[model samples]
Target: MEDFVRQCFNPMIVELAEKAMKEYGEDPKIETNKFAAICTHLEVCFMYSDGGSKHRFEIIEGRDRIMAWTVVNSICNTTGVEKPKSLPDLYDYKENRFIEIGVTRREVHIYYLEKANKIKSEKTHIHIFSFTGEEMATKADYTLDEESRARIKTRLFTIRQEMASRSLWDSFRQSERAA
Candidate 1:
């Protein structure tokens, strides 16, 4: 459980999100629901950690809030502590995929980049990546380090534990097969 949250989420969310999930939103209009739904009715302005634009949404009490906190969690998951500014090794515009060239902290950073086939919305997918503790700085002009190098260096237990828990490890890393 610690592994899932370390630098990935704030403990406060458990209460805040769940509280909102249980209480508010009557006649709720969910255009595209994310992470189920939520509690309080107060305006709360929110922006992603990775950042696109600040969003102000649902709620009566205060802030740029929305109906659910799952989306907020998604933003948190997308990038919690490390706040990576790097891009993946490749991006597929048609498929709307982003893939990192390296594995840091035993996982590859992958992002599904497109929002909707409908809205010009930049919030299509919500995901996160962090700095590998062994963070080796590189330049954009550099050859770019190989993801393979970091893979072997990452503790096998890290990979196994996460994969065993989420299976998402495979889904995210699976793209490497084609790349």
Candidate 2:
């Protein structure tokens, strides 16, 4: 997690954070924690074909405005059906679906069907993803160097825990053979 934050996430998201922060107020210094915290919604959607069926969805929510997102190597399964013109055509709500109802924490959750044709005849693997957390109107406060690093680590830990608990890898593996 630490490695990913330092190598992959921090460097990649710096420019985005800079622009996002500018939306709130004047051009500001980049604080890792503050910028990461400001990101209430983070997502990466990828499509794959003939690859090993070893993928899952990781999603979680909490009280404070903090969220985590990791790129799914294989989030889609296109066996016999053509890609839909509209995104909404890919979702299936009745199978293995779960929704969150929070007072302050608002999230956009969706379940993508792995096998659209075999809804009843076979086990339908579901790929779950969400747009969550709360990015407020005000810019975040800045912290000192060490304090900022510690807080960033804390956010990373939260992300790790939330992702680990909600992994759907097992289901993904099971449905691969079924496909």
Candidate 3:
């Protein structure tokens, strides 16, 4: 998972840890939960979308509640597929940044901008994925979206355990051996 996140995921939980450290002062109790929440959220998100697609989203506003902004340019879902007409505005300064995701306010997850990175979707466009309240608060805070988790676990089992699905994993092994 460490290698996978480092190589493929540009967004790092390290940033989340840093934010917590700054806010609460080196409290691993707080930072670690946020870190786990991020990875678990990513896993669940990818699992649900297989990894997900465009039609699965909507852009609602944080202020007006009745208002909306949309995926004009679009952003990539966890699966890295641009949701065509929709994308997450996960980029914010923790301003009014946290808001409804996953068709509700509950799936709300925290996001962080690295010191070296420019904040996206701050003014007009915002892209976000689920990280919410007490759910973000410690170890006791670890929670799972069981519905999403079970669904994806079943889906992944097919790819991971079946002989018919061996090609994807097999090829990697074979190629590595060949090289």
Candidate 4:
């Protein structure tokens, strides 16, 4: 169940959340029940990062909601990926530099950057598989539509092709074995 949650359900929910953010702005109030239901149907466990609360998601009959609270010090619902070993020291054109925000376990690190007049931006870059030459990929293509769908699909296909041509599968297989 844990493996299934990490590999399949979390990624799918992340993709859906990202799509919603892109399409509807960062309101965070939009209805994610449908997407959540799909994940729940897959038997994935759901946990909120802010409070470490667990949600007992029910996908059937189109009902889903948070059920109970659990205390955890680290981020929850992560896709079992690690954080980047070293980030660039210089700030980007967006006028923000990444700073370590928190650490999840020994291998995962979270970072955030502050920009003038904007909410502090946060991102987690993982490097646990870096040495193996395998890159993490998202399956966001399942949720896109129309123009956005076409563009993302093309980009993902190109990425997959590049990975294949570079013999990344060998490294990825090695990384999986190590994991």
Candidate 5:
């Protein structure tokens, strides 16, 4: 049962993780429930479209939501297939820049810059994927100073290493099974 479930969702989870890494500089949290939810939403978005020529997606404002759209776009673009219309326009929700992603098990895993407020004046973009299982404060107090940001980058690298290690192990098991 474990293997069956893993087989069904691992590829998509990893793909999303890879997409998160590619976009936000680290792997995303592997919440299978969230993964399933996003895929269902995407599936439905494409279901009603006319061969990707015309489509509509409801406004879901978050990093994971955006990442899923991007992943689907990347896949479609790479495969030489048509993509849903107005996909990029979905990202025009004010001045948002994804800084930290998957910071906790909370519903909002992405913390981004929404316009230049008095507190956070810097307009430069910074990508971050924080490690899980830490005593993280809420978004308001979560200061992205150079010191704490450096710490986050330090911990996130382990997640990438583990992902690579798991990929290696899976390949080895497949090779053994064939032998």
Candidate 6:
């Protein structure tokens, strides 16, 4: 198994953080510090199966935003930062099918500037890379059949519905304000 923090995850996160700093003028390291200030804001969400079956999702939320993508792209563009040897791709199941299982990660961090007495926050969202077969699956011989896919989709929908019960945008706004 790939080291989630270094090999499989951190590279993409670092890239997105760099991009976000350039595009949004937000420092990634500072945001990281803020992550430690509050609760255990960093979290990883993933799912995988055996027998050709695969599913995974990871997100780190601190100060109510995402921070992975912005950095990755920033680092990838040669004109600016050096691109990593491999990076994650964006995946959309509804529009695209099983070409490659893309990895998308998000990080949210916030900083409170004491001198300025203000809170500066940065959220980065990144789509890492695509892996297929064994690379994507946690189990060696699992397969994702139509029924299984449907089940997973249904579960995802339920997750979305629960999040949106209070109104999606409204919940997001409330979170931001609280942060």
Best-fitting candidate, measured by lDDT? 5
Q: lDDT by residue for model 4 over 41-129, one digit each (tens)?
A: 22211211111112311111111211111101011223222332332111111212222221111121111111111222233211111
Global lDDT of each model? 0.29, 0.29, 0.33, 0.27, 0.34, 0.29
> For residues 43-109, what per-residue lDDT tens digits would candidate 1 score against the true structure?
0111111122122121122122442334334433654522223222222232233323232222332
Candidate 2: where is the Cα deviation over 4 Å? 1-10, 26-32, 39-155, 158-179
RMSD per candidate (Å) reads 14.3, 18.2, 16.6, 17.9, 15.4, 15.5
lDDT for predicted candidate 4 compared with the true structure: 0.27
By how many angstroms RMSD does model 5 differ from the true structure? Answer: 15.4
When 3 and 6 are scored with lDDT, the better candidate is 3
TM-score of each: 0.24, 0.23, 0.24, 0.20, 0.22, 0.25
lDDT of each residue in 18-124, candidate 3, tens digit only: 45345546554434333333434444344433322344433232212123223322333333432323234232222222221221123223222220123333333
- The sequence of per-residue lDDT tens digits that candidate 6 reaches over residues 130-155 is 11111123122223454544443443
lDDT tens string, model 5, 77-156? 65444454323212111223222222322212333332122124242222223334242323444333445544444433
The reply for model 5, stretches above 4 Å from the true place, is: 1-143, 168-179
Higher-lDDT candidate among 1 and 4?
1
Ranked candidates (TM-score, high to low): 6, 3, 1, 2, 5, 4
Top candidate (TM-score) = 6
Superposed Cα deviation of residue 29, candidate 5 (Å): 14
**How many residue pairs clash per model?**
21, 0, 16, 5, 0, 33
For candidate 5, the per-residue lDDT at 14 reads 40
Cα lDDT tens digits, model 2, 10-40, are 4535455456566656343433334433332
Better structure of 2 and 6 per TM-score: 6
